[PDB]
Homo-oligomer: 287 residues x 4
């Protein structure tokens, strides 16, 4: 208990091979992930926007993300990695973002080298800031962060500038104070061993679906020197399909009978929540 | 539309036979429901608590619910019914709840006759306030609410006091100013026609799964005099199963291949969000 | 009976029309808004600098929509008095601006002001301000007007006088009105003789910002009205007095081990109860405890 | 000033090293900064302040979120240990637990929770209703069961005016037994009550020196001599702030200009000093001198 969220995350990176980090859009999903046995969870920036019905276009601000993060960390001590896009503004905003995330009991954040009006890392038409501007971002963050807290610098540079230039950026970023590196949308697993060796610090691979990356296995990615594997939206995408199906079912058939087999049971829900321990205490109070 | 949220809800109750109201835990789910063609949506109190990882035991307050409601109404004008439990406190809290819900562009709320430390309406061991205390609650709410805004009084009395006593309560509640009635956990469809006739105002039936009620159809419930049918957690329950499955898959197999067929596609997601209209405008700005 | 059936935007437009000129006073919180209402002001203001400073942050565009929105909601919950809200430069691009407008409307806000500075903005009476070109500001205004209701008031603010001079500032303001701005906020005009020419050229109602310790002399409402100004803003006046008073109480308690010396400078419990209508509530509470 | 210490620890240390510890109310972060600048060692978020600032009466309408939001804003701006009013705990055992956990997460140093019924009122008003000793012990158990060690739970008793000194001491003692760290002796009307109260309860005692209530305003020294360890000034600054604000508004209304108010305003430069504004705007000009 008395270990800091940052420390828990660093320890999960070290002891797992590799550490699988799964996205959760809300506290209950975080609980499901914990129950399944994952050692780290993730708050997706795109998830934050999409869940509000907004596109992933840097419309959201620190408060949209912070509120979602707080809800999660209130429900579980499982170390949480939070997407903070490009830091929500200049040096002062970045400092605020870091301080606030720490205050919200967050374990780690990732900040990237795109320009302000950012987009999904697997989409075309991304624009990057120069190495210097990103170093500035990193300095603002490290200047105010605690030791244990993990800053993951994310580079979106591979698809635009190629492997060599990307490694250069990552190395400068580590130099500037980044703890770990998020190598976004490396298209070939053979890139990783050379990337991981050059940057030295733990590297995260983003195994998102419907992107520019093939879906490799955790084992494969570990063998190529990767320390963290991210599943940013996987559960959310399944959740949406399931929800739509229930709605269609209710609309078409005037009843949800057909959906019942696809629903988690009341008892399983109670299990995840520890509901019975609470209602029992409530009946003892009522007598 | 230039019609108020309350009016939109009243109109949906009148024009549909019956009005199906589906639960949504977040704005995106509300969008899915809208796309499918529902005329009204619902914010479940249990949903609000459970999503935060809390039991449905009246731990949540006005702010927990209000925040979830605001997020939804920001994304859709589809009239929203919001669960406000027992009103979160005394007369003044109830007044605040009503005012705040109106300010959040909510169409209707439901408030129930349980004691403060409330529970799911399909669980055993429920305790009710007397008829007088509930009338007090209703007065506090009606005293500050606009005309169009819909106050649904919910009675949890059937399982404890039986149908006759429940109808009595509901009738007093309508008298005190309730617009509509939420008849919680009526176990038999033959109860409804007598209930609906006695209370006169539109009645909501709660078709929740894994409770004390059989799952009747909308048509059946309409034939028995019911005007609204609620599906409070249906989508949420499916969402949770789907999510757990993805997590298990990723854990066991080190990859999500097996899950792919069970995922909504990027393009369908973009469709629901209108994503393309935004990213196109973004490319036109970068070309200038 | 106007408070009841009229939209916040409409209430603000009506206050601008019926007053000569409309004095708009800053309030940092709901209680201050109530004090202003009690004194008889027809419109109130949420200062962006106030929002930041009250959190202990500098007025340097660090704050986001949520910082301002939360403060605004608290105020509009307590009073129907039309509220003007400072939204800086709109908190981001076209989509953020749209969100800001929609959210402010949802928060029962009457009007906002958005300005032509660059993202990392500063106080309008400080040196070293940087502006976006006319085109970029028109873009901002379009994003806002495209989503706003009719009644809701968009005040375009130009910070251009100190940088580009009166002529260039009038040009900007006129383009801004053309792009859909309802009213104009002429920031930090140094001389009262600037106003009549400014007001005539832009046609729409003009706000003059009578902030202390700035680049403007403190003219009177009457004077500013005579020079064609329709709104006069007192953005931080109360806040500045509040801070001095608070510091003094703290010093007093520190030095003397008791607050005796401060008592004469405190609003009384009874005056507080009056502003809140406290008695009406506690009376109803005793009647509820008596039947139970 | 070094921050490897938990907020609870900082508060306990301030109680021990000061004689007595003056705790001043601040309604917002900026006020907290003013208090810090003046040299106070602990600050306070008033529940009545939270309600009143929203334009609501102090009648238990506010919930955990109203208070939590105000507390977060303060603790973001200063490490100065903050004592937060949590009324009666906002609900049952589970709500209390949530309140405690959330307050800790918000970097709060200490809370005070009282023995009134749910629909509570100002402790210096007539017509207060208390829960029995058992119900309050329940409240305290719910809180202590989830709180960290360093975090300070101050049990407040509102019982003096209703049940008298002896019954109040009994309550306080049971409360300490149930796990309370410190005691808030609300609205003792006479300074001669304190030495007997403080001796009986043993744990540090807070005296509430609020104006326009049922208590005379004694000095810190006096209260210390009578065995009191903390002295609270819950609304003092707020009351002065309100008067000052009203006066500015009257001035602007009557005279069409704020000239008469200028002498009563903190200067731009003093404001900049409290905020460290110049350090930020200077860095901003150095950044603009490349582009
Ligand atoms: Cl926990
Ligand atoms: Cl919408
Ligand atoms: Cl009001
Ligand atoms: Cl700090
Ligand atoms: Mg992202
Ligand atoms: Mg419910
Ligand atoms: Mg401003
Ligand atoms: Mg209090």
């Amino acid at each position: 208990q008395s270990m800091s969220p940052g420390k828990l995350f660093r320890q999960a990176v070290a002891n797992e091979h590799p550490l699988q980090i799964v996205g959760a859009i809300n506290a209950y999903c975080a609980l499901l992930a914990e129950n399944v046995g994952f050692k780290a969870i993730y708050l997706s920036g795109g998830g934050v926007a999409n869940t509000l019905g907004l596109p992933d276009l840097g419309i959201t601000d620190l408060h949209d993300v912070l509120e979602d993060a707080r809800r999660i960390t209130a429900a579980t001590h499982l170390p949480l990695l939070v997407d903070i896009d490009t830091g929500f503004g200049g040096a002062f905003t970045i400092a605020r973002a870091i301080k606030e995330m720490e205050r919200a009991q967050v374990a780690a954040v990732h900040m990237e080298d795109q320009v302000a009006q950012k987009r999904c890392g697997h989409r075309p038409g991304k624009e990057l800031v120069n190495t210097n501007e990103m170093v500035d971002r990193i300095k603002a963050a490290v200047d105010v962060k605690s030791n244990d807290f993990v800053l993951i610098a994310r580079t979106d540079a591979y698809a635009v500038e190629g492997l060599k230039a990307t490694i250069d950026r990552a190395c400068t970023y580590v130099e500037a104070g980044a703890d770990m590196i998020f190598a976004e949308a490396l298209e070939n697993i053979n890139d990783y061993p050379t990337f991981c060796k050059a940057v030295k610090v733990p590297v995260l691979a983003n195994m998102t679906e419907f992107g520019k990356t093939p879906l490799y296995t955790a084992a494969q990615l570990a063998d190529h020197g990767v320390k963290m594997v991210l599943y940013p939206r996987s559960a959310d995408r399944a959740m949406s399909k399931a929800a739509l199906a229930v709605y269609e079912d209710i609309k078409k058939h005037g009843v949800q009978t057909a959906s019942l087999p696809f629903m988690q049971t009341r008892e399983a829900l109670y299990e995840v929540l520890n509901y019975h321990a609470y209602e029992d205490k409530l009946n003892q109070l009522f007598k």
